[PDB]
Amino acid sequence: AQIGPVTDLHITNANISPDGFSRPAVLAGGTFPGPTIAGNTGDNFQITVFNDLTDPSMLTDTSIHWHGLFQKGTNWADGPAFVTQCPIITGQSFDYNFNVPGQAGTFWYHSHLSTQYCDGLRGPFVVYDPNDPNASLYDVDDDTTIITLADWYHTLAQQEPIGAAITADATLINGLGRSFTNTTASPLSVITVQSGKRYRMRLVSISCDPNYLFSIDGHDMTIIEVDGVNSQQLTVDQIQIFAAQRYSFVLNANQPVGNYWIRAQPNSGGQGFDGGINSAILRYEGATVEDPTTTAPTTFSNPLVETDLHPLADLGVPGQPFRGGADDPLVLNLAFANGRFSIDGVSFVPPTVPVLLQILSGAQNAQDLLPAGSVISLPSNSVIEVALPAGAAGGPHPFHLHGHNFAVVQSANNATPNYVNPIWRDTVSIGGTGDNVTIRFTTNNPGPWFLHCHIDWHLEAGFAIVFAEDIPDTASANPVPQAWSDLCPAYDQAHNI
Template sequence: MASWSILSLFALAVVTEAAIGPSAQLTVSNVQLSPDGFTRDTVVVNGQFPAPLITGKKGDTFNLNVVDSLTDKSLDTVTSIHWHGLFQKGTNWADGPSQINQCPIIPKEDFDYKFSVPDQAGTFWYHSHYRNQYCDGLRGPLVVYDNNDPQKSLYDIDNDSTVITLGDWYHYLSTQAPGVPAPNTTLINGKGRYSGGPASDLAVINVTKGTRYRFRLVSISCDTNFIFSIDSHKFSVIEVDGVNHQPLLIDSPQIFAGQRYSLVMTADQDVGNYWIRAQPNNIVATFDGGLNSAILRYKTATVADPTTTSSLSLTLNE
């Protein structure tokens, strides 16, 4: 089922909670959501979209019990989960690709994923690895922190609030899409607006003037790549795909499906509201009406849409 409803603005909001892990239960189920104001059936983890942030520390063992509670016959009802970017040394059985490393989990059954991260830290993500199921919603960020991070002196804040997900969103169900469908919406932290749709809520990232933030930018996209930027702000790239990087000053990285960046941004502008932009390559590439956008809001700023403009000169192109 897929339809637009005014109720979606209120009753079917995107649900997000605190991070979980390294030991947790992940219940995969179906709900109707409208992250962009268009209501459709989805696949979620613990009732959340995007799926909850999973965190751990370098050296941890992750114990993740995945329960298949899928019931919607219009979508795939079996599943498996891949932990994208983790090496799985000695635990290839826990890597997740269905029909390759494991049989998919069937409804009313569960599977225990157990793996260690002895020598990795950084920004990762996880997603369904059964057909195109992750495009229906089963996708979320995963962060492995390093207590001895050699770049820790470069930032002040690195927590749940500084993880930013970028994703494309489809009004077609993955099981019913004709050929390769065009995405309808850019979602930033699970929220967005589509062309011709309602003025749905946009994601807001709150900052305090003078503070340095490590933004962990995660593309949980199915297909779309984005040019990411925040008006009037620059970034220092310090990590790419789980590997530390010598700081590189930019104002706009291009990010493809599955890629991750750690971007250090100093909140050094006047107190106010600034547009966060994710220009897509295959969705309506306008920012009019808040499309492809979110909001960076300084502490004590008025709650309002930004009026800022974009001027880029240091794009990091792939």
């Protein structure tokens, strides 16, 4: 069952074997992925997170981010450690109490301390719309239509050796999959459909790193939502989904009753499907319980291309229809060298005092804020443009902005901007060498909002900045509860800081 919008959520250590290999993990709700947290648009979520972690090899502190939720007036509940809070220490709990006005769609939640979400603290977060404009396009939309794509590692995240390449050991679809090496015939996930019905499949990348080429043999997929933003219908036969992105698509169960492979090919790790790696099963009711015998095409006919997506609503693009046509036009210099990423020459290292607390304590320009050179102020009620030119090693990098979604004025692999009707989303691939992926948004949400690559290994290696949006109004806009005020003293005492 789904939990929420008011729920406890316990964070524990446990052994799991999602690909047949046992390792310890950091889990929400006792499972990988964690339980779906759900409610309706506009609801008050009160998620009391109980940190019960005891194994230091995966960190005993935690903090949880609710990915894609804007947190307007509740920046303190956003979750990124040392940006909006100190971590919750073991044996303590913290109530993330926030509202979701004006949002409805497919989201997720994850640890936002170090690389801890890779160790298992990841799960779906759905905000249903009772008056969804896409409601008539499908029959079924429930916990059984959520599809998570995850990378899974045999080596613990804190134990990945310095200087060696990090790749995953399995792709997990709905928590199950097979290992790329020493493959065993462990159970595959089954997604069940009834012939003739239409399903809102909510595809969630909970990846720490790889992008996936997602497809379903014999079927096509009609996209209706992108990162929480309703889209015009776009029929595709393959979706390249980057870390932290979401799509909803209509699946029409219009093929013969049978078994069909679900495929999720990562860009690193095991290539292909030998032994049933990178696979799950779409099973029609009344089909034999057996593996599919279908194949993929050699070449997909209608892959998703981001510039083909358009909002369902008339969202437009803020600002003026040319490069630099914004109140605050930025161009970030995104680089990598010698194991560290940097933005405008500064590698992100989390500060001792969370950025929000520094602001509440009276630091009132971004040059006063730590880490020095990592916090950029944005003015209020302004159109912001951020160009994110690619080229840094380890791409393609999926950049994500907290507190906001944004118009994708320029997408990967296409030099032409779109100032008319591009999709809006919250995580975007910046593409390849020579690209100039560019985003726009308006600043109507005071607080410090993280901007970073969502490949968690890259975030850990410094690929981030903080946008201190409307510093002057941050304190008045974001009243903080006593429990939040208690986090830093508790954390610093526990850690002898």
